[PDB]
Design a protein around this nucleic acid. Structure first.
Ligand code: SF4
Lengths: 73, 85
DNA sequence: CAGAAAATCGGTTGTGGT
DNA sequence: GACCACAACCGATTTTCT
């Protein structure tokens, strides 16, 4: 099988900006494996990265990664 | 054989990430290292090395790096620690 | 404008468990 | 004592709010 993650540079899926993670997350939408990827990553409680089209943070899904500074109100 | 291609994916990490896993699994000289020793080489504490190693293992599990490589020596143990038991 | 506040980051400390 | 997992904490920096 050919996967969208395996083309490019993989650190995109572990990108530090919320932007890079959103990019990788939309790249995952084309993956023939996606729901697998997600299930297995949840079942290993991955600490970070984008798996099956979702951002992970300490074993759960975070939807959006917080930016670096103080939050806008 | 095979030992080479993982040395490829190792080379997709930063030097500290790669070296931390190399030392942990004794890939270059057969001897696994303790977290403390590893910290001594990179000038940081053992706990920092543990955090680095956790995240790097997460990266190695990731299909972007691990999918091409699904096919008691230290490389055996590394592949084992990547996947299940 | 000038702080103050809130958050992440890379890292250490403290506690405790085999 | 050796080894390490977990959480709390720390100084720097970054961003935004008053
Ligand atoms: S679903 Fe899995 S393999 Fe596909 S792009 Fe996302 S993380 Fe990579």
């Amino acid at each position: 099988p050919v996967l969208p993650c395996h083309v490019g540079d993989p650190d995109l899926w572990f990108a530090d900006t919320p932007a890079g993670l959103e990019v990788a997350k939309t790249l995952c939408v084309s993956c023939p494996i996606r729901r697998q990827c997600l299930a297995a990553a949840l079942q290993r409680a991955e600490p970070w990265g984008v798996w099956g089209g979702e951002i992970f943070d300490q074993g759960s899904i975070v939807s959006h990664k917080r930016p670096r500074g103080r939050p806008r109100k | 054989l095979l030992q080479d291609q993982l040395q490829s994916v190792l080379d997709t990490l930063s030097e500290r990430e790669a070296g931390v896993v190399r030392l942990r699994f004794g890939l270059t000289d057969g001897q696994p290292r303790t977290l403390d020793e590893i910290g001594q080489v990179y000038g940081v504490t053992r706990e920092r090395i543990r955090q680095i190693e956790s995240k790097t293992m997460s990266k190695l599990r990731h299909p972007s790096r691990s999918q091409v490589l699904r096919d008691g020596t230290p490389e055996e143990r590394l592949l084992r620690a990547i996947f299940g038991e």
